[PDB]
Amino acid sequence: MTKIKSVRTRVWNWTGPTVPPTGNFCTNASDVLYFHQWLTCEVETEDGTVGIGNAALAPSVVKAAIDEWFAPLVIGEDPFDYAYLWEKMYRRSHAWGRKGIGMTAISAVDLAIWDLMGKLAGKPVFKLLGGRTKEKIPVYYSKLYSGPIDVMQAEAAEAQKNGYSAYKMRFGWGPKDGMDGMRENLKRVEAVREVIGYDVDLMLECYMGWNLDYTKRMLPKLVKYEPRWLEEPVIADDVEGYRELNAMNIVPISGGEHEFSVIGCKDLIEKKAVSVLQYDTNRVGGITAAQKINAIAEAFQVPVIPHAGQMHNYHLTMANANCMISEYFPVFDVEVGNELFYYIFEGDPEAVDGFLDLDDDTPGLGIEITDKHLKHFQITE
Amino acid sequence: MTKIKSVRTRVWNWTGPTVPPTGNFCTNASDVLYFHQWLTCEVETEDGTVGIGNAALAPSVVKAAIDEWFAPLVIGEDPFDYAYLWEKMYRRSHAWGRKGIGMTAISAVDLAIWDLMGKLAGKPVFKLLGGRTKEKIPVYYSKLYSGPIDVMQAEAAEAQKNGYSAYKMRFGWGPKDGMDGMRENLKRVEAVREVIGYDVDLMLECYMGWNLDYTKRMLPKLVKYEPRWLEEPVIADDVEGYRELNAMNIVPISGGEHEFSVIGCKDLIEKKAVSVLQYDTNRVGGITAAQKINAIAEAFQVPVIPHAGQMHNYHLTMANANCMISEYFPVFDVEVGNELFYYIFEGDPEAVDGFLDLDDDTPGLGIEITDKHLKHFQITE
Amino acid sequence: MTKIKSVRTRVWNWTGPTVPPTGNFCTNASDVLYFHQWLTCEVETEDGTVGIGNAALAPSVVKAAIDEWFAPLVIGEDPFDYAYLWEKMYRRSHAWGRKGIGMTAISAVDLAIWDLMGKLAGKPVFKLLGGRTKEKIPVYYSKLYSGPIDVMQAEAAEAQKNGYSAYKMRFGWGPKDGMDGMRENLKRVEAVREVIGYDVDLMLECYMGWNLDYTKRMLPKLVKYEPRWLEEPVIADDVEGYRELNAMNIVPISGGEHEFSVIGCKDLIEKKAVSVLQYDTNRVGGITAAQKINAIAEAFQVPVIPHAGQMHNYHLTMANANCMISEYFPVFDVEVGNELFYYIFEGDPEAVDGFLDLDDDTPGLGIEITDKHLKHFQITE
Amino acid sequence: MTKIKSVRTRVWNWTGPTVPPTGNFCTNASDVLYFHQWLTCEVETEDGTVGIGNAALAPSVVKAAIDEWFAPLVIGEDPFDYAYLWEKMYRRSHAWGRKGIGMTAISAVDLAIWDLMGKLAGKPVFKLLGGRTKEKIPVYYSKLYSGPIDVMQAEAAEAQKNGYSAYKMRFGWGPKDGMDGMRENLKRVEAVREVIGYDVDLMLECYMGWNLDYTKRMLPKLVKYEPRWLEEPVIADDVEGYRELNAMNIVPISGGEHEFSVIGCKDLIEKKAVSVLQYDTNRVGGITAAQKINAIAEAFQVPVIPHAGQMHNYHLTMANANCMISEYFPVFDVEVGNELFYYIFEGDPEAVDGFLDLDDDTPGLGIEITDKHLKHFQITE
């Protein structure tokens, strides 16, 4: 048994070319009001093995938490005491850490620790989690930001070429735009359906942009388009609103990507706040947490479909039969900031004809930090 | 109308003399496992007026959030747009901020902004909040850390001299110590009652040290001592456990000091998770938040008794009739870290014969950052 | 600090020209059976400052309550002890005052006291409440009393010129008129939609004219017209009926304008009696009360849209992000009695292109009692 | 059939000798803060018959409501259309009348109307209500205001002479007095039990003086004294608090004397807010209302024991088997104001050996307004 030696946390700033977003083009929690980054966490053991974790939420602030509070707790420990290390981090920072910065920092560390275990054991992380429950992993195409109709329609037609069985689009108007914005929203769902048809699934996303009232009034209007779910209609604090909308059984409500810890997600599950749970492993508390969340969701038969198409999620999805598909979009330009991971890591699979797959023999998470794009980054430590 | 010019956030490290705690001497969320600081936030307007905020949770990490994310949002704004500024901070950081680091940073800023408004208006903050609902504010004596019986008994006898009508003590044993620890806990409640008697109230505190199971078994055993409440028996994430214990109606359950945002506390209230709500204004989201929380709690007739005896809480308590007493302990040595505020600020009232009071004429929060103890501090910016 | 000196309460009787209403033209709580006035309350401090409050419910009887019970309680007090004064009035009259006459009298007094504070502090009331959360305040056009189809249609077309994004109309038939009245009601919703279209919102009002049974049967029939809410289908005492209708999720149920006190409204909110809360500040208990109600509603994410387009409501709406629009109608003749305020006060903004706004610099409520129409009034004291 | 001709409403002010109350001597809704009158309403028909109603809440303000709004509605009507007249008053004033002043005014009028019907029909009101369900009516002794122990004990011993099977006392300390006040309260319950013993019932009254929190903590402490109920622990608005305390099943909670209308009381009943309902007929809406309330309470098997020992309650109690006892105290001096009725009316029975009775042959309510005490009254109209 080798022990954790060091924790190297870095904040990556995109200095490369960018495409400024447009009007809309996605509703947001800030709508009611009038540098793109990523974080890497590399954990190395005395024997030189290195595990890679990451986070995207408030990277500099998360790095300061990892450096000051979490790194010192894991140094000199066996990675295979992961549950104990998770608990140690969770309880030592509980006062301020149980959601937000703390739990995100914990995720990045825990992710690295799992990469370690797989590398130390010569096994892909998914094997340690239960192994192969699926031949390959279907994905749904997740982009279709709101914009002019012809623009959105052309995007749908292009995406269609790679044979997805499901698609997700974003809304552009909310409560501030009243009924006219409702009509604009509906026009765009309509336009996307015209291209992709009704032999595929269409999911809708509000990104915390709406509210309980607007959502209750909009819901009946969405039925004709047969959406598979409506994601984050309300702000993440408004769990009672989630339950209320979900219990209406008009369109399945989804969320969780802004929820933290095992208990946090347990409460969304038990209270029937979501029909689909979409935590991001690099937020929710790491694989240690997500593994436990997956057991709960499975037992309640609430589908888990993690936010984000990355390895830190794909291995979890592979190992659990109640995780049937993953979120995906291919490597395009930097426009929103969530694409940054494709320029920092090598190893994230590319979907082909609606599927991607994991290698039975690649140890750990199967990612490495890459050189290819150092030119477009300013990296701080 | 003058506008916010700058935000000056500093982390204070106690380098002065200290008294190392002992066995026990308070249960803790970390019990299941096998420098003292404070933060100041000074907001200054174009006309030189300065408002003082503060926080105690993870100060360096909170300062990094204030500096990077929150300060830039309030600069160039009217302090009297406080609700808008609160909302701006809350929604812009919602993804990662709604509890923990984010909401704590927001609290420190919001507190400064309220100090400003009172100074700008030549009114004590409590007047802006509704004014004087009480002749003076009764306090309960909040120390009595767990230790040898004679030690605890001597502390009680000393405290007794200042005529408190209520006292709170801490437990020293939890789930790990089984029945023997239960007996040790009960001996100490017993010992304190022997000194203070049954013509006063005794509150008990676990500081997240216990759990749902242990607490259910302990509750019947506490009845004979007539405790007024049992504070934070479980970890802050375990809200369902809170509800379950509270609904037993054996001893009133209290908590909230590790809860964040208006909605966070609304849920503790509506779900009957606590019989007494004890948020700390320098965590929960500032006075803007605490004012709204107080309205909810009042309407539900759940007493609000903020965690901590400081001005950032006392003004709130003065202005609302459902806030009947405050937490207090006088200026003693530095032993735990929570005493640090008495060496950084002047203006926090001292209880005399169980009461303290606010000045009808002192503008703002009535505190200032002091020189007296610069010798015992290393202050970083 | 200056103290309250006097309270001057007057009842205004319209002696000017009037337009007698017609068949229908609005359902009413009295349908099951077979002088227009307003009240002013002027509170003056020792230094000559005067704050203006008002009420419209049973003015002579409300004046007698203010004069005998409430005025004497506030005289010689600091306006900035408003919360204490509110509590004093509320508890001293609780036995008979907690709703109806008492709470209405309290509202008028409390409103004056808030006008004072803003004037004393040289700030618009909304700044003291949290400040500017909105660029301007959208309004919905609130008239469209029931009548002949061409009449209603012409009103809609005229209103349309001022560019409202939402409209409210009144029903003319209820339970007594059975299915034929249902058809008459539906014809009129139909007729209004023909003019205004489906790119705007249409709200419907029953003014306590219907009942639980009739409403349950009517609800499915209203769906095709996509109404945004149905206001006061039942009498204000029938809160269980409200909950039952609201939980059907057929059309959002609204109400509250006949509800009183913070707790009164808290119960409508917690019990899910309304989807939209519409208290009138000059009934519900004044700004002191409405401010606390707004915090509760916001936390539950129940939109607050006060009954009546006046300053006593607009400032509240400006200061809270969960208050997104206000009720409005422009100055027309005296026909119903609710128009009387436009002839008594100057300062109530006029909506232009669907919006109105508040002045960042006008202290207090920004209203004054006017001379312009003394000719059409007989004023008693 | 003769028709209502006039309504004569008068306010009686006691100018006679009085005994100023003392420290305590009863908790009150105003405790949290730091002329005695009665109303008569005489309704006369075209044939000279006169029915007598009354009220005690805010008499001048109630008279102004009766005079302006309610009298005009009943003039020229048959008294035997009482239900229609009740409905007419209730709905015409609903906006402002459904509780408080309005419903109290309605009570006084409705009471007169019932006196009329009995006189017109040559029957005691109780016969019209269902007749004699009891041989006589047991009463409980209702005084024992809080004071020095020997004083309270001497009162109990005196009362004991008239052979009551039940007694009610008032508490003198509340939330402001903390644990010491709890001990003072308990001493007095103890002292009263020492005199009266445990072969009788003891009821306790707080008169809205306590709160939900204090009451939950006090309840276990009251068990040893075997109280039959605890009356109005919280303010009348706090119905959720009532339900919560009542559901604890520690001591039966009672209330309702500050509740109004049939629906108001229905909600206390259905929601299990009280174990005993104690409306006062001269508040709750008159006999028309109380008759309907009695049917509801009976069906739910919630005992009805009206507040106040007067004819307006006794007839109701006689006619319903679920009304087993009445409140009583004999004619003593004027000290509190609630004794005033004994100096205004003749006909209210006097309890002897714990019982009083109604005359099978006396028409109407069996009361008349008396001359005996005109010397001690200034009567306004």
Please answer whether residues C188 and C156 qualify as being in contact, where contact means their C-beta atoms are separated by less than 8 angstroms.
Answer: no
- The shortest CB-CB distance from C235 to any of D65, D94, D235 is to D94
Q: Which chains touch D (3 or more CB pairs under 8 A)?
A: B, C
Nearest by CB: D248 against B198, B249, B275: B249
Whole-number Å distance between alpha carbons of C9 and D307: 35
Q: Do D234 and B301 touch (CB under 8 A)?
A: yes
The torsion angles phi and psi of C326, rounded to 5 degrees, stand at -125, 160
Residue appearing with tokens 């913070």 = C262
B1 contacts C360? CB cut-off 8 A: yes
Q: Which of D36, D94, D258, D307 is catalytic?
A: D307
What is the spatial distance between Cα C154 and Cα C150, in angstroms, rounded to a whole number?
6
At which residue do the structure tokens 């100074």 appear? B119
Which tokens in the block code for residue D331? 């004619």
Provide the β-strand partners of residue D380: D11
Contacts of D108 (CB under 8 A, 6+ apart): D9, D39, D41, D53, D54, D55, D62, D66, D282, D286
What the block records as the tokens of D277 is: 């309902």
In angstroms, the CA C58 to CA D96 distance is 7
**Can you spell out the DSSP letters for C228-280?**
S-EE--S-TT-HHHHHHHHHT-SS-EEE-TT--SHHHHHHHHHTT--SEE---
Q: In chain C, what is the straight-line distance between the N-terminal and C-terminal CA atoms, in Å?
A: 29
Residue A112 CB contacts under 8 Å (≥ 6 apart), including other chains: A7, A41, A42, A43, A51, A52, A53
Closest CA relative to residue B53, chosen from B125, B1, B123, B121: B125
Residues D234, A150: Cα–Cα separation, whole Å: 64
Angstrom distance (rounded) from CA B320 to CA B292: 11
Q: What is the resolution of this structure in A?
A: 2.4
Q: Which residue type does B290 have?
A: A
Residue type, position A236, single letter: A
How far away is chain C from the Cα of D97, in angstroms, using its nearest Cα?
Answer: 6
- Reading the block at residue C327, the tokens are 């009720």
What is the C-alpha end-to-end distance of chain B, expressed in Å?
29
Report residue D104: phi and psi, to 5°. -70, -45
Reduced to 3 states (helix: H, G, I; strand: E, B; else coil), residue D267 is helix
| Angle, in degrees to the nearest 10, between helices A239-247 and A262-270 | 30
Distance CA C73, CA C89 (A): 7
List residues of A with catalytic annotation: 307
Report how far residue A330's alpha carbon sits from residue A155's, in angstroms, rounded to the nearest whole number.
Answer: 13
3-state DSSP assignment of residue A114 = helix
Solved using: X-ray
Find the angle CA(D235)-CA(D241)-CA(D242) to the nearest 5 degrees. Answer: 80
Q: With an 8 Å Cβ cutoff, are D101 and C101 in contact?
A: yes
Which among D102, D239, D261 is the nearest to C101, CB-wise?
D102
Angle at C276 (CA atoms; ends C275, C280), nearest 5 degrees: 150
What distances in angstroms separate CA D372 from CA C319, D196, D343, one per listed residue? 61, 35, 8
Q: Please state which architecture CATH assigns to domain B1-122+371-381.
A: 2-Layer Sandwich (3.30)
CB C350 within 8 A of CB C104: no
Q: Which amino acid is at B18?
A: T
Q: C277 with C250: CB under 8 angstroms?
A: no
Q: Give 3-state DSSP helix, strand, coil % of chain D, rounded to 5.
A: 45, 20, 40
The set of chains that have 3 or more CB pairs under 8 A with A is B, C
Q: Do chains D and A touch (3 or more CB pairs under 8 A)?
A: no
CB A29 within 8 A of CB A205: no
Interface mutation vs chain A, best among B28, B101, B268, most A CBs within 10 Å: B101
**Peptide bond just before D25 cis, omega within 30 deg:** yes
Decide if B364 contacts B116 (C-beta within 8 A). Answer: yes
Q: How many residues does chain A have?
A: 381
Distance, CA of C102 to CA of C112 (rounded, Å): 16
Q: For residues A110 and A116, what is the distance between their CA atoms, to the nearest angstrom?
A: 10
Distance CA D186, CA A284 (A): 53
Contacts (Cβ under 8 Å, ≥6 apart) of D269: D277, D296, D297, D300, D302
Give the start-end residues of each E strand in B290-354.
326-328, 345-346
Residue D221, C-beta contacts closer than 8 angstroms, at least 6 positions apart: B226, D182, D186
C156 and C195 Cβ atoms separated by less than 8 Å: yes
* Strand A37-45 with D37-45, pairing: unpaired
- Report how far residue D68's alpha carbon sits from residue A229's, in angstroms, rounded to the nearest whole number: 59
Separation CA C288–CA C163 (nearest Å): 33
- CATH, domain range C123-370: 3.20.20.120
Torsion angle of the four alpha carbons B197, B199, B201, B206, in this order, in degrees rounded to the nearest 10? 20
Structure tokens at A76: 């000199």
Ranges of H-type helices in A99-175: 101-121, 125-129, 149-159
CB C310 within 8 A of CB C350: no
CB distance D258–C95 less than 8 Å? yes
Residue D59, classified by CB atoms within 10 Å of its CB into exposed (0-12), middle (13-18) or buried (19+), is buried
Closest CA to D122 of D359, D379, D375, D374: D359
**Calpha distance B344→B10 (Å, rounded):** 12
What residue of C is the nearest CA neighbor of D261?
A: C237
Q: What's the DSSP call for residue B42? A: E
Q: Which residues pair with D326 in a beta bridge?
A: D139
Decide if C237 and D264 are in contact by the 8 Å CB cutoff: yes
Q: Which of B228, B246, B324, B355 to mutate to test the interface with D (most CBs of D within 10 A)?
A: B324
β-strand pairing of D166-170 with D137-142: parallel
Nearest neighbour of A32 by CB, restricted to B57, B91, B99:
B91
Q: How many angstroms separate the Cα of C273 from the Cα of each of B297, C226, C233?
A: 20, 21, 12
Contact indicator for C9, C39 with CB cutoff of 8 Å: yes
Beta strands in chain C (DSSP E): 4-14, 37-45, 50-55, 137-142, 166-170, 201-205, 230-231, 253-255, 276-277, 326-328, 345-346, 355-356, 368-369, 377-380
Residue type, C242: Y
CA B203 to chain centre: 15
The three-state secondary structure class of D12 is strand
Report the C-alpha gap between B186 and B171 in whole angstroms: 9
Residue with tokens 């003394």: C374
Structure tokens at A91: 């309880």
Q: Kindly report, as residue ranges, where domains of CATH 3.20.20.120 are found in chain A.
A: 123-370
Is residue A8 a contact partner of residue A53, using CB atoms and an 8 Å limit?
A: no
- In chain A, residues under CATH classification 3.30.390.10 are 1-122+371-381
The residues near C82 (Cβ < 8 Å, ≥ 6 apart) are: B130, B131, C110, C113, C114, C117, C288
DSSP, collapsed to helix, strand or coil, labels residue D81 as helix
HSE, side-chain direction, 13 A CA sphere, residue C309: 25
Contacts of A221 in chain C (CB under 8 A): 226
B136 CB-near residues (< 8 Å, 6+ apart): B355, B356, B357
H or E segment to which residue B102 belongs: helix B101-121
How far out from the chain centre does Cα C112 lie?
A: 17
Q: How many CB atoms lie within 10 A of CB B314?
A: 27
Please tell me the number of Cα atoms within 13 Å of B52 on its side-chain side. 18
List subunits contacting chain C, requiring 3 or more Cβ pairs under 8 Å.
Answer: A, B, D
Which two structure tokens, joined as six digits, stand for B59?
């100060």
SS3 D286: coil
Angle at B25 (CA atoms; ends B21, B28), nearest 5 degrees: 110
